[PDB]
Design a protein around this motif. Structure first.
Motif, PDB file in Angstrom:
ATOM      1  N   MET F  37      -2.081  52.362  14.825  1.00  0.00           N
ATOM      2  CA  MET F  37      -2.528  53.372  15.777  1.00  0.00           C
ATOM      3  C   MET F  37      -1.981  53.078  17.170  1.00  0.00           C
ATOM      4  O   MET F  37      -1.373  53.947  17.820  1.00  0.00           O
ATOM      5  N   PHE F  38      -2.173  51.844  17.640  1.00  0.00           N
ATOM      6  CA  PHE F  38      -1.589  51.480  18.925  1.00  0.00           C
ATOM      7  C   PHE F  38      -0.077  51.650  18.899  1.00  0.00           C
ATOM      8  O   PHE F  38       0.524  52.021  19.910  1.00  0.00           O
ATOM      9  N   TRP F  40       1.707  53.897  17.231  1.00  0.00           N
ATOM     10  CA  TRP F  40       2.028  55.304  17.442  1.00  0.00           C
ATOM     11  C   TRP F  40       1.881  55.674  18.909  1.00  0.00           C
ATOM     12  O   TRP F  40       2.734  56.377  19.472  1.00  0.00           O
ATOM     13  N   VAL F  41       0.813  55.200  19.552  1.00  0.00           N
ATOM     14  CA  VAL F  41       0.673  55.427  20.991  1.00  0.00           C
ATOM     15  C   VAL F  41       1.899  54.895  21.725  1.00  0.00           C
ATOM     16  O   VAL F  41       2.463  55.557  22.606  1.00  0.00           O
ATOM     17  N   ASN F 141      -8.335  56.768  10.357  1.00  0.00           N
ATOM     18  CA  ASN F 141      -7.257  56.982  11.313  1.00  0.00           C
ATOM     19  C   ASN F 141      -6.180  55.912  11.181  1.00  0.00           C
ATOM     20  O   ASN F 141      -4.989  56.208  11.328  1.00  0.00           O
ATOM     21  N   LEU F 144      -4.064  56.834   8.226  1.00  0.00           N
ATOM     22  CA  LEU F 144      -3.204  57.957   8.578  1.00  0.00           C
ATOM     23  C   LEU F 144      -2.029  57.498   9.430  1.00  0.00           C
ATOM     24  O   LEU F 144      -0.884  57.896   9.190  1.00  0.00           O
ATOM     25  N   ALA F 145      -2.293  56.650  10.426  1.00  0.00           N
ATOM     26  CA  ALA F 145      -1.234  56.196  11.321  1.00  0.00           C
ATOM     27  C   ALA F 145      -0.198  55.361  10.582  1.00  0.00           C
ATOM     28  O   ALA F 145       1.009  55.516  10.807  1.00  0.00           O
ATOM     29  N   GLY F 148       1.907  57.591   8.492  1.00  0.00           N
ATOM     30  CA  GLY F 148       2.815  58.323   9.352  1.00  0.00           C
ATOM     31  C   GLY F 148       4.007  57.492   9.773  1.00  0.00           C
ATOM     32  O   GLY F 148       5.146  57.963   9.762  1.00  0.00           O
ATOM     33  N   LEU F 151       6.421  57.220   6.785  1.00  0.00           N
ATOM     34  CA  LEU F 151       7.186  58.400   6.406  1.00  0.00           C
ATOM     35  C   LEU F 151       8.128  58.863   7.512  1.00  0.00           C
ATOM     36  O   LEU F 151       9.213  59.375   7.215  1.00  0.00           O
TER      37      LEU F 151
END
Ligand code: CLA
Ligand code: CLA
Ligand code: CLA
Ligand code: CLA
Ligand code: CLA
Ligand code: CLA
Ligand SMILES: CCCCCCCCCCCCCCCC(=O)OC[C@H](COP(=O)(O)OC[C@@H](O)CO)OC(=O)CCCCCCCCCCCCCCC
Ligand SMILES: CC1=C(C#C/C(C)=C/C=C/C(C)=C/C=C/C=C(C)/C=C/C=C(C)/C=C/[C@@]23O[C@]2(C)C[C@@H](O)CC3(C)C)C(C)(C)C[C@H](O)C1
Ligand SMILES: CC1=C(/C=C/C(C)=C/C=C/C(C)=C/C=C/C=C(C)/C=C/C=C(C)/C=C/C2=C(C)CCCC2(C)C)C(C)(C)CCC1
Ligand SMILES: CC1=C(/C=C/C(C)=C/C=C/C(C)=C/C=C/C=C(C)/C=C/C=C(C)/C=C/C2=C(C)CCCC2(C)C)C(C)(C)CCC1
Ligand SMILES: CC1=C(/C=C/C(C)=C/C=C/C(C)=C/C=C/C=C(C)/C=C/C=C(C)/C=C/C2=C(C)CCCC2(C)C)C(C)(C)CCC1
Ligand SMILES: CC1=C(C/C=C(\C)CCC[C@H](C)CCC[C@H](C)CCCC(C)C)C(=O)c2ccccc2C1=O
Lengths: 30, 33, 165, 81, 73, 176, 88, 733
Positions: F37-38, F40-41, F141, F144-145, F148, F151
């Motif tokens: 998550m971090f 992706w940020v 989440n 999901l991250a 993501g 992919l």
């Protein structure tokens, strides 16, 4: 002239072989 | 290509031996199994 | 003995419990190889070969609408389909094989229990009677053992003489 | 098949040779030695061997010489008894 | 001599004693046998001989080196 | 299930690492999900910086004399300043990571399972759906991250475009 | 850790390969940080090997707390040495 | 369990650091593991062999990948005489800028190591031309190693573990590993040479994408079946053939030209193909000798039992050897090691004289490296063979099952063997050293005319017998009116004679008194090493000093200072002592080879012929003279590409010296010192907090001897490798 894709797939096959080595050694069973 | 050696040589010569020696030290003197 | 070969002794290791058994091993390999694993491998080869035969025969007359799907011979077809599709199908098969792994190398289960089973097909087999179970198993073994030689001849003919016929 | 004394048991010659009487083995060994020596001499001694002089018959005859030695040993073994 | 000293310095007495046993058998087979039985050098003597030859070899090497380097003048 | 059988196989193979939490365990899943998550940020921020040139851009390569032979790639070539900048933005977080890994806040979740404790129960295919700052939301989440990242990396590798450019292609082409 | 972190930046800063570059102090600080990380790894493994079957320092939990404190204090000492040397 | 080494309860309970050290040195001795049975021993050996094969194939794949990804293989194949092959890049953060600039060579654009393995020449000869081919080979080898690792895991499963009877099925193993492993493999290799190597050498690109439609020969197997095999020998490559191109190329695929390819100064590819075809045929025929559940074949136990001469001079003959060999892994391991060592020596001796690889023999450094490498490995293998034979005698020999056997009679007259070996060793040493010192003394007094220069008449006679028309012997192939030359005149004699009589070759180098003296020194070395090893093996089961030695095992420190002292009395100590002699004799051999080849390459072979008769010549004209480019790798003025080799030279010297530390000073001193060290640590504030878990003790006697020998060997090898590589690469000779 080996492209980055060739190096990457070589690395992937090496990783698979490394995992197999891990398992074989584990099975030799100290 | 031309970037990998920088990433890997430190891992193979410092990080890998460091973690390997840490784990071997733990296991040699585990005192159980 | 040896129904298959009249002039050879029935191979000692094998006995009728395995479907398709006719005591054919003339080399006596059955006494050195894990017969459960050999049966599982033979069954997987049978199913793959039957699928390949039906696929090449159906493809030999009709194809999907796309032009790049219009290759007529199996070898030209593999040459023509883009790498993305080959990788996609290979990934599907790899997932199925990885799922099969843990069950394949057990020893307390039969060959049919080793290879992954379609739940509908497995339930149908379980509901079947023992005699009918063995009958269907023999049917599968024999049809597939024919299909294996069929597909091998198909591919060799395609490679040598152009068309698989 | 360990044997002591001065002559080995016939079973050392194998299932087939062990049943052959000594004179038969002696004549066979003489024929084999003659053929092998004659073949080895005709090519590469009496005639130089070239690329287009390789006779399969002479090769077989040359291979027959160790057969001659084996048969002469077997003949002696059969003769002692 | 310096290299020769290493034979005594590295090796031990048992090997040499057994080798001498074989050689003594060879002598005896021809009725040659000293009344004073041969013996491999004692452990302490083995070390002493090794050290003496080591020192002699080193000292002589430097002796020749210095004298020839400082007499070509 | 197949996942359960794989986890049991891993536990049997490597009991020590599984016990400590290393490997396929829910604690590892949560940690990797938080990191992803971090990540992706940080990829979004990197794209924005590249768009606005906050990064010194690849035009400039670090000088060998000042930054030593570590800056050397192959022979004469040197790491570009943009790669160095991203690496340092990552090094900040890595230093934080060591600090919080060996000296965790008492209320913080430990990196490794405490000796006495055992790993928490498996979430399942669809983790229990509860909104707000609840563990299930965090785990969902994180999954999901990570998916993501996988992919989008696959897209970039297959098509050959850079990962940042593939991210740009998504969204509404806001970044670069 | 506070004692040994401030203590360790100086040698790398002044005698490291980048001592003559204008970034010598930062390289020294980073080297000190890496060495501190190595030493904390050493401490953790020693604790997990020695005391296995809050208190006196000779216990699993006591040594774990000591090691966490040592890491924090060592990073603090290195950072403080950097801050001091940055302007001197 | 309960500690690190499970396989040893005794070591597990050991409270000292010894537990660790021995835990490393007893790992692979499966026989001694607690609760070990024969079946588990064999299965574990099988899995370990699978793992070792995987390691070998990964090593090879790594070589291929590094050459493909970082090498200059394409540039090299373009111009293989002037450019230097590349091994891999050098990413070393410790380098300074001048070092980076200095090690940038060959293709350049990165620091790089110049490969001295000769793999470039080998791969070029076998038909590879592009980095893509190397990459594909490496990927294939990685997949193969993964497959072998999986097979090793698989054959440890309960339902796949082969039974004990399977391992001891000698007949089938021999049949398959002869006809299959050796013969079919050779058939496949000659198929490769016909289909790929030869066409690639003639400018035609054959690959996986087109090798099924372009027959290697225009006639295409019609002559083979029709029996007109001569067709495959017709139209060979003419002497004016540019290797790798169709300029002057031929069409033959199986010829017996002999000699060397003029352009590459190596063997003809077609000759290699015919060689390997014949070898494959012979091995395939040989593999049908033993019976395997098919009625026909030989039973080896009967063969061994039957060969007992009636004269009784061999006693019971070979009775009982079958059981000893099949039941003892150490005996067969020693046999295999010895045969492998002989073959390694043979490869070293034959590759230099008969160059198999295109454009090799001009890359001097590669030739020297390969020869030294294989000779040292041969020495190691021979020492290992004798060591495992001693082990077999210790723990596998059964004197009741070998009564009056040939092997028992070996021990019956061991004294004679050892005494006559000692006599030969003393004779050779005394007299060779005496001749060398005599030459040294006479030359020292300015009277070189008084030297005892002995002409090697016998070796020169052998050279003449093969066709060396330089010594004027006029014997066998050196005389036209001889049956041998006329019989062979048609097939291979012309090319072989052209090669042998040409002095631009390594085929039968001209020899003189120096070669004579050095060969006798080599004989001394071999005889002395054999004396040591044979004495160890034969006295392993007991001596007059230790009549019950067999009860103490193969490796024990001593039997105390009693009855005269018994240091280094075990067979392991015999191996340890023989290792020094092996290193010394291999060093003599490699020094002889390197100096002769260096003098030949420089263009003044007279220097060797003059200065090899006295030892000062060896010390001055070979070591002192050829080390100048090496020790100058880095000086206060600067550094060059050889700096690494100079550093390794000094490193090898340091390790060699450090070995003396363990070989000279023994345990008691060190244990008494560690006592004080322990006291000091225990009596220090701020350090009493940290306490060892394993009690620190000095190294054991046997361990100390082993470590000293290991340091000695590592230093020896590193220093000599550095010297041989650096001198040759610095003076191009
Ligand atoms: C055709 C059938 C076949 C084949 C191919 C093999 C092959 C092998 N077996 Mg198997 N085996 C067989 C039948 C067979 N076996 C049968 C029937 C039995 C039952 C009795 C066994 C029982 C058995 C056991 C119990 C073991 C093996 C092992 C091995 C391996 C030996 C090590 C190796 O790498 O070989 C070396 C291969 C070579 C070709 C080298 C040849 C040697 C010469 C001297 C080298 C010269 C080559 C050349 C001139 C040098 C130049 C090349 C250079 C340019 C690269 C090898 C893979 C061992 C192993 O490692 O298991 C994995 C082992 O422990 N086998
Ligand atoms: C040819 C090499 C070889 C082979 C085949 C073996 C085989 C074996 N050894 Mg021996 N050993 C060797 C070399 C070898 N050893 C050496 C050099 C030493 C040191 C002197 C030892 C010391 C030793 C001891 C002390 C013991 C063994 C044991 C064993 C057994 C199983 C060990 C195992 O795999 O467990 C499982 C191990 C693993 C799964 C670890 C595998 C290592 C992985 C592949 C490393 C991969 C890391 C990778 C490079 C990281 C790169 C990251 C990068 C990106 C930065 C087996 C009989 C044990 C045994 O069976 O005794 C009876 C035992 O107790 N060995
Ligand atoms: C045994 C074979 C072998 C050997 C000795 C080397 C040696 C080297 N490699 Mg190469 N490599 C190999 C095989 C090998 N490689 C293979 C098969 C691949 C394909 C994946 C690569 C891919 C590769 C890359 C991409 C890079 C190197 C690099 C390097 C160098 C630095 C080490 C490093 O970072 O490793 C990194 C290697 C890996 C992460 C993969 C592991 C390599 C092999 C497969 C492991 C073999 C282990 C071996 C059997 C022994 C195990 C026991 C051990 C644990 C004690 C070094 C010269 C680096 C370099 O050139 O720096 C200048 C670099 O960037 N290697
Ligand atoms: C049951 C299986 C099967 C069947 C029905 C056929 C049937 C036929 N084959 Mg095929 N074939 C087979 C197996 C089979 N073959 C196998 C296993 C091989 C490999 C040895 C071949 C190799 C082969 C070749 C090489 C050729 C045929 C040809 C033929 C035809 C004569 C006929 C249609 C011939 C053909 O195409 O006829 C025009 C032809 O040239 N076959
Ligand atoms: C494939 C062949 C082969 C096989 C299967 C074996 C197998 C065995 N040998 Mg044999 N051996 C061999 C070859 C072989 N050896 C050779 C060639 C030699 C001659 C040197 C020997 C000499 C020998 C002796 C003298 C003894 C054995 C013993 C043994 C057994 C125990 C080995 C052990 O515990 O390892 C332990 C492994 C180690 C201690 C690792 C040491 C590795 C080396 C020495 C260090 C290398 C350092 C490295 C290169 C430095 C890097 C350089 C860098 C710093 C620059 C085992 C059955 C012992 C026994 O009693 O068997 C019953 C025994 O006493 N072997
Ligand atoms: C340069 C060093 C050196 C030398 C010359 C020798 C010499 C010898 N060794 Mg030793 N050895 C050495 C190093 C050396 N070794 C080392 C480092 C090791 C490893 C530990 C060994 C291990 C070893 C073993 C294990 C064995 C030998 C054996 C031998 C003999 C081999 C046969 C031979 O040459 O006979 C000729 C003898 C010589 C060349 C010795 C020199 C004789 C000189 C020329 C005579 C001088 C006489 C003169 C008047 C002296 C006057 C003294 C006065 C001024 C005080 C011989 C005694 C073998 C043996 O005993 O064979 C019977 C044996 O079994 N050695
Ligand atoms: C140079 C050798 C290097 C390798 C090491 C030795 C390994 C091989 C050992 C055998 C060498 C050959 C021995 C020939 C031995 C040989 O040819 O004779 C063989 C003969 C014994 O033969 P048999 O016992 O098989 O013969 C039975 C008799 O009744 C005759 O039929 O011994 C003698 O005649 C007397 C002793 C030899 C006298 C020879 C004088 C000439
Ligand atoms: C830190 C950082 C960043 C970041 C980040 C991080 C931490 C990202 C992490 C991403 C991560 C960690 C992604 C994992 C995915 C795993 C997947 C998809 C696994 C599938 C696994 C499957 C499909 C397994 C299948 C099987 O097991 C089954 C079901 C049963 C077995 O019988 C068979 C097998 C084994 C086949 C930036 C910003 C990105 C860059 C910046 O520089 C700094
Ligand atoms: C702490 C932090 C934060 C936060 C963070 C977060 C929370 C993040 C998240 C992130 C995330 C959360 C991300 C995600 C991502 C995801 C993705 C990117 C996805 C993808 C997907 C896909 C790709 C899909 C695919 C598919 C389809 C299409 C359908 C279905 C199936 C499949 C799978 C095929 C803030 C801001 C405060 C700041 C600081 C830091
Ligand atoms: C006198 C002398 C001596 C000695 C000396 C010494 C030994 C010294 C030492 C010194 C030292 C040893 C010092 C140290 C210092 C330290 C410091 C000063 C620290 C600080 C710290 C800090 C400041 C921290 C901070 C922090 C933290 C904690 C974390 C993070 C955050 C912060 C940053 C806040 C003698 C007598 C012998 C002799 C003469 C001289
Ligand atoms: C310890 C021991 C052991 C081992 C031993 C050994 C190790 C041995 C070795 C041995 C050897 C190592 C040998 C060698 C050999 C060699 C040879 C035998 C050679 C030969 C050759 C010949 C016979 C001839 C040739 C030729 C010809 C053909 C003719 C002309 C000339 C020429 C040369 C060319 C064992 C295990 C058994 C066990 C017991 C104990
Ligand atoms: C070679 C050797 C022997 C054997 C050496 C012996 C028996 C010495 C032989 C001496 C001879 C017989 C005397 C003549 C020697 C010279 C010709 C000249 C005399 C030299 C001085 C004695 C004056 C050991 O006994 C020994 C014991 C312990 C450790 C190492 C070794 C060791 O290395």
């Amino acid at each position: 002239m080996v492209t980055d894709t060739q190096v990457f797939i070589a690395l992937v096959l090496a990783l698979i072989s490394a995992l197999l080595a891990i398992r074989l050694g584990t099975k030799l069973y100290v | 290509a031309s970037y990998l050696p920088s990433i890997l040589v430190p891992l193979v010569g410092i990080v890998f031996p460091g973690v390997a020696m840490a784990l071997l030290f733990l296991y040699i003197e585990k005192d159980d199994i | 003995m040896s129904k298959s070969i009249p002039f050879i002794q029935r191979p000692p290791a094998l006995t009728g419990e395995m479907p398709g058994d006719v005591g054919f091993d003339p080399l006596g390999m059955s006494e050195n190889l894990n017969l459960g694993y050999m049966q599982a491998a033979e069954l997987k080869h049978c199913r793959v070969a039957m699928l390949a035969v039906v696929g090449v025969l159906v493809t030999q007359f009709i194809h999907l609408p796309a032009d790049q799907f219009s290759a007529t011979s199996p070898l030209d077809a593999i040459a023509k389909v883009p790498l993305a599709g080959h990788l996609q199908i290979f990934g599907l098969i790899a997932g199925l094989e990885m799922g099969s792994l843990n069950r394949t190398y057990d020893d307390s289960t039969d060959a049919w229990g080793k290879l992954i089973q379609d739940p509908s097909g497995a339930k149908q087999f379980a509901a079947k009677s023992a005699a009918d179970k063995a009958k269907s198993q023999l049917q599968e073994i024999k049809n597939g053992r024919l299909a294996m030689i069929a597909i091998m001849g198909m591919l060799i003919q395609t490679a040598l003489f152009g068309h698989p016929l | 098949t360990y044997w002591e004394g001065k002559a080995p048991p016939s079973k050392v010659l194998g299932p087939v040779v062990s049943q052959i009487p000594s004179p038969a083995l002696g004549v066979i060994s003489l024929i084999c030695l003659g053929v092998g020596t004659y073949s080895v001499h005709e090519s590469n001694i009496f005639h130089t061997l070239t690329a287009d002089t390789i006779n399969p018959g002479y090769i077989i005859g040359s291979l027959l010489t160790p057969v001659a030695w084996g048969t002469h040993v077997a003949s002696w073994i059969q003769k002692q008894n | 001599i310096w290299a020769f000293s290493l034979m005594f310095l590295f090796s031990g007495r048992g090997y040499w004693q057994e080798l001498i046993e074989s050689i003594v058998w060879a002598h005896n087979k021809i009725k040659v046998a000293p009344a004073i039985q041969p013996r491999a050098l004692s452990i302490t003597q083995g070390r002493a001989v090794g050290l003496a030859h080591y020192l002699l070899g080193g000292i002589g090497t430097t002796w020749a080196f210095f004298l020839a380097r400082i007499i070509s003048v | 299930s197949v996942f359960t059988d794989a986890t049991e196989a891993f536990s049997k193979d490597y009991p020590d690492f599984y016990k400590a939490g290393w490997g396929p365990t829910t604690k590892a899943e949560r940690w990797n999900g938080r990191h992803a998550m971090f990540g992706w940020v940080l990829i979004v921020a990197t794209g924005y910086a590249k768009a606005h040139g906050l990064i010194p851009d690849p035009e400039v390569a670090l000088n060998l004399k000042e930054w030593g032979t570590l800056s050397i790639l192959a022979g004469p070539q040197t790491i570009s300043n943009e790669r160095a900048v991203v690496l340092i933005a990552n090094v900040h977080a890595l230093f934080m990571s060591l600090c919080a890994a060996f000296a965790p806040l008492s209320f913080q979740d430990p990196l490794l399972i405490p000796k006495g404790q055992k790993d928490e129960p498996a979430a399942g295919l669809i983790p229990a759906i509860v909104p707000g700052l609840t563990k299930e939301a965090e785990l969902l989440n994180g999954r999901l991250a990570m998916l993501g990242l996988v992919l989008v990396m696959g897209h970039s590798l297959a098509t050959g475009t850079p990962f940042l450019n593939s991210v740009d292609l998504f969204l509404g082409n806001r970044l670069g | 850790g506070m004692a040994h972190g401030y203590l360790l930046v100086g040698p790398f800063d002044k005698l490291g390969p980048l001592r003559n570059s204008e970034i010598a102090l930062l390289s020294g600080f980073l080297s000190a940080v890496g060495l501190i990380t190595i030493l904390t790894l050493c401490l953790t493994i020693y604790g997990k090997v020695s005391f296995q079957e809050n208190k006196d320092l000779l216990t699993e939990d006591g040594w774990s707390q000591f090691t966490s404190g040592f890491l924090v204090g060592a990073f603090g000492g290195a950072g403080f040495a950097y801050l001091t040397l940055l302007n001197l | 369990a309960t500690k690190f080494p499970k396989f040893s309860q005794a070591l597990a309970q050991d409270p000292t650091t010894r537990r660790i050290w021995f835990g490393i040195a007893t790992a692979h001795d499966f026989e001694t593991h607690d609760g070990m049975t024969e079946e588990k021993l064999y299965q574990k050996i099988f899995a370990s062999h699978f793992g070792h094969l995987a390691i070998i194939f990964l090593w090879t794949s790594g070589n291929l990948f590094h050459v493909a990804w970082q090498g200059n293989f394409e540039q090299w194949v373009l111009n293989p005489l002037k450019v230097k092959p590349i091994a891999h890049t050098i990413w070393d953060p410790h380098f300074g800028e001048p070092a980076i600039k200095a090690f940038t060579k060959g293709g350049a654009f990165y620091p790089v190591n110049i490969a001295y393995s000769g793999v470039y020449h080998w791969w070029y000869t076998i038909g590879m031309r592009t980095n893509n081919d190397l990459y594909l080979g490496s990927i294939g080898l990685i997949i193969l190693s993964g497959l072998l690792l999986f097979a090793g895991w698989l054959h440890l499963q309960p339902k796949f573990s082969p039974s004990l009877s399977w391992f001891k099925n000698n007949e089938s193993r021999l049949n398959h590993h002869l006809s299959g492993l050796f013969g079919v493999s050779s058939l496949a290799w000659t198929g490769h040479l016909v289909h790929v190597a030869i066409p690639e050498s003639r400018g035609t690109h054959i690959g996986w994408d087109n090798f099924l439609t372009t027959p290697p020969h225009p006639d295409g197997l019609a002559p083979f079946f029709s029996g007109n095999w001569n067709v495959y020998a017709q139209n060979p490559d003419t002497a004016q053939h540019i290797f790798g191109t169709s300029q002057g190329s031929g069409s033959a695929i199986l010829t017996f030209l002999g000699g060397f390819h003029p352009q590459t100064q190596s063997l003809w590819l077609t000759d290699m193909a015919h060689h390997h075809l014949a070898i494959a045929v012979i091995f395939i025929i040989a593999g049908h000798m033993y019976r395997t559940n098919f009625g026909i074949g030989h039973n080896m136990k009967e063969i061994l039992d039957a060969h007992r001469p009636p004269g009784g001079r061999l006693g019971a003959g070979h009775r009982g050897l079958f059981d000893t060999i099949t039941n003892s892994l150490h005996m067969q391991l020693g046999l295999a090691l010895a045969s492998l060592g002989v073959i390694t020596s043979l490869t070293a001796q034959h590759m230099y004289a008969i160059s198999p690889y295109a454009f090799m023999a001009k890359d001097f450094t590669t030739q020297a490296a390969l020869y030294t490498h294989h000779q040292y490995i041969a020495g190691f293998l021979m020492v290992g063979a004798f060591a495992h034979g001693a082990i077999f005698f210790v723990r596998d020999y059964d004197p009741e099952a070998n009564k009056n056997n040939v092997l028992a009679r070996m021990l019956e007259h061991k004294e004679a063997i050892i005494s006559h070996l000692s006599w030969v060793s003393l004779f050779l040493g005394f007299h060779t050293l005496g001749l060398y010192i005599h030459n040294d003394t006479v030359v020292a007094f300015g009277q070189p005319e008084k030297q005892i220069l002995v002409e090697p008449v016998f070796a020169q006679f052998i050279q003449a017998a093969s066709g060396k028309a330089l010594y004027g012997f006029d014997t066998l192939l050196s005389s036209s009116e001889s049956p041998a030359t006329v019989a062979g005149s048609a097939i291979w004699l012309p090319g072989w004679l052209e090669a042998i009589n040409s002095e631009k070759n390594d085929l039968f180098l001209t020899i003189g008194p120096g070669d004579f003296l050095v060969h006798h020194a080599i004989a001394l070395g071999l005889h002395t090493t054999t004396l040591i090893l044979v004495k160890g093996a034969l006295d392993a089961r007991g001596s007059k000093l230790m009549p019950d030695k067999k009860d103490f095992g193969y490796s024990f420190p001593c039997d105390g200072p009693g009855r005269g002292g018994t240091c280094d009395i075990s067979a392991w100590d015999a191996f340890y002592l023989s290792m020094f002699w092996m290193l010394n004799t291999i060093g003599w051999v490699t020094f002889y080879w390197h100096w002769k080849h260096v003098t030949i390459w420089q263009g003044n072979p007279a220097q060797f012929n003059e200065s090899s008769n006295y030892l000062m010549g060896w010390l001055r004209d070979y070591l002192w003279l050829n080390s100048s480019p090496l020790i100058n790798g880095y000086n206060p003025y600067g550094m060059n590409s050889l700096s690494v080799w100079a550093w390794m030279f000094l490193f090898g010297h340091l390790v060699w010296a450090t070995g003396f530390m363990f070989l000279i000073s023994w345990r008691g001193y060190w244990q008494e010192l560690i006592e004080t060290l322990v006291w000091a640590h225990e009596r220090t504030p701020l350090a009493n907090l940290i306490s060892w878990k394993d009690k620190p003790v000095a190294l054991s006697i046997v361990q100390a001897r082993l470590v000293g020998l290991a340091h000695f060997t590592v230093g020896y090898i590193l220093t000599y490798a550095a010297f041989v590589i650096a001198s040759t690469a610095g003076k191009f000779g």
